[PDB]
Amino acid sequence: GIFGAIAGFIENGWEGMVDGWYGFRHQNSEGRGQAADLKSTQAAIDQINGKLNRLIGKTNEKFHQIEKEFSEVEGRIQDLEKYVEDTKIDLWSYNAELLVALENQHTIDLTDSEMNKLFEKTKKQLRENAEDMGNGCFKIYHKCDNACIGSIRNGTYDHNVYRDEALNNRFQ
Amino acid sequence: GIFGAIAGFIENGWEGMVDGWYGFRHQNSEGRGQAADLKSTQAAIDQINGKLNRLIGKTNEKFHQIEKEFSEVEGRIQDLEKYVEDTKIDLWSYNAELLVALENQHTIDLTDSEMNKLFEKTKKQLRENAEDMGNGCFKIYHKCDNACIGSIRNGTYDHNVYRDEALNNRFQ
Amino acid sequence: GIFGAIAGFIENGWEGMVDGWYGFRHQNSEGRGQAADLKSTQAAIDQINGKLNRLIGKTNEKFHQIEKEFSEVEGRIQDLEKYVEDTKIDLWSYNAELLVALENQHTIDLTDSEMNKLFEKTKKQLRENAEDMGNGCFKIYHKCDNACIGSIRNGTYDHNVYRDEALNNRFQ
Amino acid sequence: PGATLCLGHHAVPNGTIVKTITNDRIEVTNATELVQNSSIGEICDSPHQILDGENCTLIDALLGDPQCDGFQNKKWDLFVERNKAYSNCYPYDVPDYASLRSLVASSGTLEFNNESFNWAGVTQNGTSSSCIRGSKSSFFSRLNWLTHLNSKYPALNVTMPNNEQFDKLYIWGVHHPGTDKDQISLYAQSSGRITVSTKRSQQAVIPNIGSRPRIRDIPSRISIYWTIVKPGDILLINSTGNLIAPRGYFKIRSGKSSIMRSDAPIGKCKSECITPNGSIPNDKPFQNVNRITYGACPRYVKQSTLKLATGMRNVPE
Amino acid sequence: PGATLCLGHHAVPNGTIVKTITNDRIEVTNATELVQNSSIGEICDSPHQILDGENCTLIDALLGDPQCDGFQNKKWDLFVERNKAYSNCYPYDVPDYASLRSLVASSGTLEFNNESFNWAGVTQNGTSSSCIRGSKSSFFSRLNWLTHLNSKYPALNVTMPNNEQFDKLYIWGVHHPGTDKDQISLYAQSSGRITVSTKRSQQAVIPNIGSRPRIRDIPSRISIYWTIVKPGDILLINSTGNLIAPRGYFKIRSGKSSIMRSDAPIGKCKSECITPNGSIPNDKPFQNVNRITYGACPRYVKQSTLKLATGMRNVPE
Amino acid sequence: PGATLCLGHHAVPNGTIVKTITNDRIEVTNATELVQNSSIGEICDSPHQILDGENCTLIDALLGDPQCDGFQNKKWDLFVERNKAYSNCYPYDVPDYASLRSLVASSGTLEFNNESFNWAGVTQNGTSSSCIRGSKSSFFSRLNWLTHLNSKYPALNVTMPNNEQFDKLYIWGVHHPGTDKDQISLYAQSSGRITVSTKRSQQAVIPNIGSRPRIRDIPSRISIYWTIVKPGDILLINSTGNLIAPRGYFKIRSGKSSIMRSDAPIGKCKSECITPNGSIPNDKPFQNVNRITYGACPRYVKQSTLKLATGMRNVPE
Ligand SMILES: CC(=O)N[C@@H]1[C@@H](O)[C@H](O[C@@H]2O[C@H](CO)[C@H](O)[C@H](O[C@@H]3O[C@H](CO)[C@@H](O[C@@H]4O[C@H](CO[C@]5(C(=O)O)C[C@H](O)[C@@H](NC(C)=O)[C@H]([C@H](O)[C@H](O)CO)O5)[C@H](O)[C@H](O)[C@H]4O)[C@H](O)[C@H]3NC(C)=O)[C@H]2O)[C@@H](CO)O[C@H]1O
Ligand SMILES: CC(=O)N[C@@H]1[C@@H](O)[C@H](O[C@@H]2O[C@H](CO)[C@H](O)[C@H](O[C@@H]3O[C@H](CO)[C@@H](O[C@@H]4O[C@H](CO[C@]5(C(=O)O)C[C@H](O)[C@@H](NC(C)=O)[C@H]([C@H](O)[C@H](O)CO)O5)[C@H](O)[C@H](O)[C@H]4O)[C@H](O)[C@H]3NC(C)=O)[C@H]2O)[C@@H](CO)O[C@H]1O
Ligand SMILES: CC(=O)N[C@@H]1[C@@H](O)[C@H](O[C@@H]2O[C@H](CO)[C@H](O)[C@H](O[C@@H]3O[C@H](CO)[C@@H](O[C@@H]4O[C@H](CO[C@]5(C(=O)O)C[C@H](O)[C@@H](NC(C)=O)[C@H]([C@H](O)[C@H](O)CO)O5)[C@H](O)[C@H](O)[C@H]4O)[C@H](O)[C@H]3NC(C)=O)[C@H]2O)[C@@H](CO)O[C@H]1O
Ligand SMILES: *[C@@H]1O[C@H](CO)[C@@H](O[C@@H]2O[C@H](CO)[C@@H](O[C@@H]3O[C@H](CO[C@H]4O[C@H](CO)[C@@H](O)[C@H](O)[C@@H]4O)[C@@H](O)[C@H](O[C@H]4O[C@H](CO)[C@@H](O)[C@H](O)[C@@H]4O)[C@@H]3O)[C@H](O)[C@H]2NC(C)=O)[C@H](O)[C@H]1NC(C)=O
Ligand SMILES: *[C@@H]1O[C@H](CO)[C@@H](O[C@@H]2O[C@H](CO)[C@@H](O[C@@H]3O[C@H](CO[C@H]4O[C@H](CO)[C@@H](O)[C@H](O)[C@@H]4O)[C@@H](O)[C@H](O[C@H]4O[C@H](CO)[C@@H](O)[C@H](O)[C@@H]4O)[C@@H]3O)[C@H](O)[C@H]2NC(C)=O)[C@H](O)[C@H]1NC(C)=O
Ligand SMILES: *[C@@H]1O[C@H](CO)[C@@H](O[C@@H]2O[C@H](CO)[C@@H](O[C@@H]3O[C@H](CO[C@H]4O[C@H](CO)[C@@H](O)[C@H](O)[C@@H]4O)[C@@H](O)[C@H](O[C@H]4O[C@H](CO)[C@@H](O)[C@H](O)[C@@H]4O)[C@@H]3O)[C@H](O)[C@H]2NC(C)=O)[C@H](O)[C@H]1NC(C)=O
Ligand SMILES: *[C@@H]1O[C@H](CO)[C@@H](O[C@@H]2O[C@H](CO)[C@@H](O[C@@H]3O[C@H](CO)[C@@H](O)[C@H](O)[C@@H]3O)[C@H](O)[C@H]2NC(C)=O)[C@H](O)[C@H]1NC(C)=O
Ligand SMILES: *[C@@H]1O[C@H](CO)[C@@H](O[C@@H]2O[C@H](CO)[C@@H](O[C@@H]3O[C@H](CO)[C@@H](O)[C@H](O)[C@@H]3O)[C@H](O)[C@H]2NC(C)=O)[C@H](O)[C@H]1NC(C)=O
Ligand SMILES: *[C@@H]1O[C@H](CO)[C@@H](O[C@@H]2O[C@H](CO)[C@@H](O[C@@H]3O[C@H](CO)[C@@H](O)[C@H](O)[C@@H]3O)[C@H](O)[C@H]2NC(C)=O)[C@H](O)[C@H]1NC(C)=O
Ligand SMILES: *[C@@H]1O[C@H](CO)[C@@H](O)[C@H](O)[C@H]1NC(C)=O
Ligand SMILES: *[C@@H]1O[C@H](CO)[C@@H](O)[C@H](O)[C@H]1NC(C)=O
Ligand SMILES: *[C@@H]1O[C@H](CO)[C@@H](O)[C@H](O)[C@H]1NC(C)=O
Ligand SMILES: *[C@@H]1O[C@H](CO)[C@@H](O)[C@H](O)[C@H]1NC(C)=O
């Protein structure tokens, strides 16, 4: 991925997370748990559904056309009819090949981006109370119970509440 | 956006900024103000103008071609003439649709990138004298008058001048 | 570049580095040196080779087709044969032009991304022992001899060994 | 002690390989197929009005081959021409056969209106044992084989004005006798002329006498021609022998009708897209079933499969 | 107290909706239209040399229809053929009419050089009341209607060598009399032959006698043919009746000339791109005005609008 | 003192300019050319079986022009037709010449099987001084010029059944005498008829008498026609004069064979892609050498160069 998160500084995915595409795993004093992040999951799904919406169920109507199979040798005109159809099929086959390759590259990059976005969002939320371990995990330098973890996942974490405790543990 | 700045950690744009695409808003002891960043604005405009330069005013010359409207029923040859033109129009309509969709996606991402670039550039400039609040705003932990703000916008800010004052305010 | 590293916060490339695409330059107590990073170099080369693999040596076989040069004026049928071929050539010329422009834009962005990835990887490795100077260089706040520099390049740098020394030098 | 907060993404045990710009084989959590590669094996009779030609080609249904009498005045969105179809009337050919078949198929109708031509002085309704209808010698239902009366073939000069608001399609022919003996026997003179004209067009045909290989014991041949008469114009037939006369005109329309060669059976189902292999679903944008299609159809491509990634890269364990 | 430094981007109160790969409706600060959907309603007479055919088709200007005498020896980049144009001379047709019209339009010139053929023994300059020029019975200006002299039509055998450095285009014809009486009246024998040949080509036509519906009281018809003579080759005309002779040759050139059917008026303006609707600007890469174009034109597409984003995403308030 | 650790990338002193979506001129460390713009100037004789026509067109090799006797029964993947080729036998033309040349070139073989036709009552093996073979007057090797015997041309009515498992291609012709004197001299009657038919097709030709410009002192002309006979069908030839008879049939096949006009010499080398300019390498996906190609070839484009970046942006010093 072009952002370096998925298959990057995040070592691997979680087969155990089945209610979301992105999420949090925590270990604190009350145990260890898992929770999916709905907003980032929805953001990736909406973009992929936007791709599907303009590729699926959008066929054009064609009716009377040219003949494309021939039982007799005819020469010039039949050569042109065959050449016209072979030309068209090759150009559409090229369109289809390029389309899928471009879309898949973009899909991998956009899902990698959503993972990086959630990581950056969480990092800025923690301010001076945590340090990036480099593998997608934050070392939080204060007691952070389940309500505290839930406040980070909900976006309501107030870093000033724990700042004095965290700075003391960080900078010994 | 794939970088998460525009319509991302930056809540909304500034309708009040009319001399640039990207810029700074500050509040200090001398008041609050606004200033556009010319280099990042120019970088985004140059790339979009590069797109326009190869799409606008680049038409090909065609002269004598095939007939495309018919008043009489003729059969085989007319079927082929109509099929050739319908094939061509569909392929060019596909080209035009895909072109605009790809370019617009890239334009949104490149303008999002230029916003992220300016944010990262400013962040590194401030070193240990400021903290990212997470909404595109920096909390600067020292007295920073208009000349001090102007030095950040000009790229001449010397972090060592204020480091002792900032570290003292940051780490109480 | 869309990530802002190459031709961005990295001022220029190193003509003196001929064994890799990305690498490290250091100055410490034992001197100053240079070393290429193989993994990031290989990552960029593998992606470009993936592009070349589906563009080079993949031609289709065509045999008997239509005539494309004419010595006599014939009228309707010759008009169609010429129009069919001119239509095909224009669509393939468009395909080739768009293909190269898209691939080159992606190649510049992916090589810029690999540079940014290596920078971010090194930054997280240093934890609180170094500061980003903003030009792709880290100021390391502890004595870091050649073995210490080599541990950073190898990914085996233990930040806890130097943390007390670094924090003392950083926060005077 | 503090806490650890780890950011991550999901993964699946059953990934799917897709292609990208940089990699021909990369595994994502999920994908969807963009190339339809199967048909249900039958042509659904909805929503397009299907006409199964059975043993009849469209041209044979047009001329009035005896096995095609059930097709009189029928209409269709898609005429399905079976590969088993065969002719069983007087031996004939159509110069530019493909164009007549195309324009009738595109018109989508075999509506025929009888007209009373003034064939004064000749014998009408000639028949042949090569064209049996009801155990008797007969002929194309829409054509009138004119021959001599009392060993006289007086010159024909007949008009038929088009006072309608639509175009008329006239099907007529020229009989090529096998021998000069047959030419005398049928038309009482050594050589015929046929001139069919309007204010906009003229068609002149001379019969070509000679032995052709026998079909149902007939060494002669008929050549089929057609003429379109615009409103306010007039059909003028001027002949001194060998004329296979029309019995009226066909309505010629414009619309979405066509013809398809297929051996697939007709089924009672609904499908927008028809191929000679049968109907195919049209949810996917591409298909590799058949380059011949009718209706709202995916575009034919050479690839048998194209997987569109619908999830992130799969990074297990 | 410190300070706060906020990074941001602009926004506008009047955004524009565009499409992307992931969204069919997303608002950006500004966009530009890539599909030209309007014309000024007139064909600009610069920079292409326009020839307004008015009441004359190109073929009628070629043959010399009396209302087309002002078009003699004219040249054009684009010949504009009006839908009101009508023929007003002897009734004629052109086998492969579309090809003759195409090759003359592509040649871009009606330059005609008279040549003196040796029509020894026949009457020249036949006329008809169906082709009035100056209140008198006349004929196509570039064609020579030959008839009998003293009830004799001696066989014609005439040559015309091409000693020029360019190709010659010869227009000639065959008269199809309405009756055998007319055939005798005009050519003094029961059947004509016409053979027009060079060292590279041969054309042989037999007249077809028969009544056609009358146009300006004429039941006869002329069929128009053409022959190209290369430098160093020779035109050989060999006929025993019914020959509509050429009066010379047309220069046939190669270049950028063409023909367009249009009813739009000609205006005094400048525009590179011409459509039957009128001239259109060519700044945009695509257009949905007309699939028929001439000049430096945007490419025809089915879409009526395609908005190219020229600014960032618009995020107001 | 600490240490400084700088991250960076390489650069080169000799960059290459490429195009992107946003920039027409941007310098990268390296690029590769995607448009082949050169040929080696010769057509490699491997891996495709090349047949150098030399002085012979394919049609002249088909009919049996004396300078083409070495081409009898030859086969080819690509027939190379030289622009210097010229005919040197009886003057002839082929209606739809391009189609006969196309179907024979696509068939890829001149295998010819002699058949014994029963030309009872006529003189065979007519010759002409316009077609010299071995310093004697001769004729097309695959054609049989039939003329009168004892001033009698009895009507011909000959059959030749196709009892093989493949299609037969028959080449025959019609002689157009220059004068009525020649018609009597050759065929002992004033007008000929030719009818060539099968159970599926019929072809009838009438000779057209008239003077054509002389080629090798011959004012007459032959017109070449062809007929394909399916297995189980029969060829029937029915003529009373002017028949240029076939001596047998050609095998007609399906495959990858074709024909190309070129003056490039044949070389002893290997190359999948052939153009009239000569063989070109096919490593690149596009080429601007020639729109005419044969084999595994890059696609023709209008651009003379397209540089694909294979390295990062070059940022020196
Ligand atoms: C007073 C007097 O002397 N008057 C003279 C007349 O007698 C004379 O008429 C001719 O008389 C001879 C007598 O020997 C003969 O009967 C002529 O009739 C033809 O005969 C041949 C030989 O049998 C026959 O050929 C056979 O045809 C069949 C097929 O037959 C049909 C069919 O297709 O079913 C019969 C149809 O009625 C007929 N259609 C029409 C509209 O008449 C067609 C048609 O003739 C063919 O399809 C055209 O090819 O044929 C089969 O093909 C056998 O293989 C074949 O041998 C002809 O069919 C008979 N012709 C007719 C019209 O019936 C008879 O004309 C007259 C002229 O000679 O002169 C008077 O003075
Ligand atoms: C000594 C002796 O006896 N000599 C004999 C000759 O007399 C004889 O000549 C024929 O004589 C009869 C006498 O009754 C008659 O006049 C013949 O002339 C034709 O007459 C018919 C009947 O009126 C006429 O048909 C009418 O044609 C007009 C249109 O007229 C023009 C036109 O288009 O304007 C007149 C043009 O001059 C003419 N063009 C040329 C080059 O001659 C054309 C052309 O004939 C037609 O366009 C061809 O279709 O016609 C209108 O169409 C009316 O509706 C129609 O009734 C013919 O036009 C007259 N033909 C001519 C050539 O003028 C006259 O030939 C001779 C042969 O019978 O035998 C001698 O022994
Ligand atoms: C007892 C009695 O009286 N019987 C009568 C016969 O005599 C008579 O036959 C005719 O007799 C006259 C006598 O003056 C004459 O010889 C006729 O022969 C033709 O003569 C002309 C004039 O020279 C000649 O034209 C020249 O042809 C050459 C080319 O010659 C060839 C060639 O192409 O090489 C010769 C070939 O053999 C011939 N091919 C065949 C298959 O016969 C071809 C062919 O004829 C042409 O290619 C067709 O265009 O020609 C050159 O073109 C000169 O420029 C040209 O002047 C003809 O070629 C001679 N024709 C033949 C067949 O040889 C002779 O027929 C008979 C009929 O009048 O009536 C009896 O009662
Ligand atoms: C130019 O040359 C062609 C070719 O020779 C001639 O055309 C042939 O004409 C003859 C009649 O003259 C045709 O012969 C007929 O064939 C029919 C089909 O024969 C096949 O089928 C039967 C069984 O149905 C087999 O026994 C036979 O072996 C074949 O396999 C027969 O049904 C006919 O028989 C009937 O008529 C004859 C004749 O009166 C009676 O004796 C019989 O008892 C029976 O009633 C007949 O044999 C032949 O088919 C034609 N061939 C082609 C290819 O068309 C042309 O006539 C000639 N042109 C001129 C002007 O002469
Ligand atoms: C094969 O059959 C066709 C069709 O019947 C014949 O062609 C017709 O020939 C007749 C003449 O024989 C033509 O009749 C002429 O029609 C002209 C146009 O008539 C219309 O316009 C007039 C007013 O201008 C109306 O009054 C009339 O009702 C029509 O609406 C008339 O102008 C002619 O009149 C002049 O000539 C006659 C005859 O001499 C004089 O009596 C008159 O006073 C006047 O001077 C004339 O009536 C008819 O138009 C032809 N029809 C077609 C479709 O072409 C062929 O002749 C026939 N073939 C053979 C060989 O016989
Ligand atoms: C319809 O009209 C055409 C055109 O006039 C006639 O066709 C011409 O017919 C004559 C014969 O009647 C042909 O004349 C022959 O030309 C040959 C080529 O001449 C060129 O080359 C020679 C040198 O080889 C030069 O001297 C000459 O100037 C030319 O440049 C000559 O080789 C012939 O000469 C031989 O025959 C004559 C006649 O017997 C002898 O006197 C000579 O000694 C010599 O043996 C001859 O001159 C002419 O080429 C034809 N022209 C065309 C264009 O085909 C038709 O005949 C006529 N139709 C009818 C039915 O009459
Ligand atoms: C189109 O129809 C017209 C009229 O029906 C045909 O004209 C007619 O042609 C016949 C000949 O086929 C003429 O009969 C002749 O009668 C005279 C009597 O003197 C005689 O000399 C001839 O031997 C022949 O028997 C008839 O008079 C004539 N009618 C008219 C009004 O001219 C015409 O032939 C038809 N054209 C075609 C191509 O069928
Ligand atoms: C091409 O032109 C040539 C020459 O001009 C034509 O040849 C000529 O044809 C006529 C017949 O149409 C011949 O006249 C005949 O005269 C004899 C006298 O004995 C007589 O028996 C016939 O009834 C007829 O009147 C003439 O002699 C002849 N000339 C030559 C030199 O052969 C030829 O017919 C033209 N071809 C075409 C297709 O128009
Ligand atoms: C196809 O071949 C057949 C048979 O070979 C041809 O039929 C034959 O045609 C000739 C006329 O060209 C007939 O000869 C005639 O003989 C009578 C004797 O009474 C006489 O009146 C005539 O003047 C002529 O000499 C011959 O009888 C006839 N044979 C048969 C069996 O009918 C036919 O002409 C050929 N068709 C073509 C288009 O070449
Ligand atoms: C995979 O994607 C397709 C297309 O959106 C969807 O129908 C299918 O349910 C997806 N599979 C899973 C397991 O979500
Ligand atoms: C459809 O029919 C064509 C023609 O017979 C055949 O080549 C193709 O394999 C068929 N495809 C399927 C999916 O049945
Ligand atoms: C241009 O003319 C065509 C043909 O009449 C018509 O269909 C189309 O609507 C016209 N477009 C404009 C913009 O006038
Ligand atoms: C190839 O031949 C064509 C036709 O003569 C010519 O236009 C073109 O310039 C040639 N190209 C090369 C590379 O020789």
Numbering used by the authors:
A (entry chain B), B (entry chain B), C (entry chain B): 1 to 172
D (entry chain A), E (entry chain A), F (entry chain A): 9 to 325
The publication says:
Surprisingly, considering their extremely high sequence similarity to contemporary clade 3C.2a counterparts, a panel of six 3C.3a recombinant HAs and whole virus samples from isolates spanning five years from 2013 through 2017 all showed minimal selectivity for extended human-type sialoside receptors present on glycan microarrays, with widespread recovery of binding to glycans containing n=2 LacNAc repeats. However, the observation that 3C.3a-descended strains, which bind both short and extended receptors, possess only very few mutations relative to clade 3C.2a contemporary viruses or 3C.3 progenitors (which maintain selection for elongated α2–6 sialoside structures) has provided an opportunity to gain valuable insights into receptor-length preferences. Surprisingly, only one HA1 amino acid, position 159, stood out as a feature that correlated well with both the loss of to binding short receptors in post-pandemic strains, and reversion to binding short receptors in clade 3C.3a. Comparison of complex structures between Ecu/16 and Tex/17, respective representatives of clades 3C.3a and 3C.2a, reveals a potential role for residue 159 occupying a space in close proximity to the reducing end of the 6SLN2 receptor fragment above the RBS. As described, when present as S159, H3 viruses bind similarly to both long and short receptors; however, when present as the alternate commonly observed variants Y159 or F159, the otherwise closely similar HAs bind preferentially to elongated glycans. Analysis of the Ecu/16 (S159) structure reveals that the smaller serine side chain creates substantial additional space at the top of the HA head domain, allowing free rotation of the reducing-end GlcNAc (compare the turquoise receptor in Fig. 5G and S5).
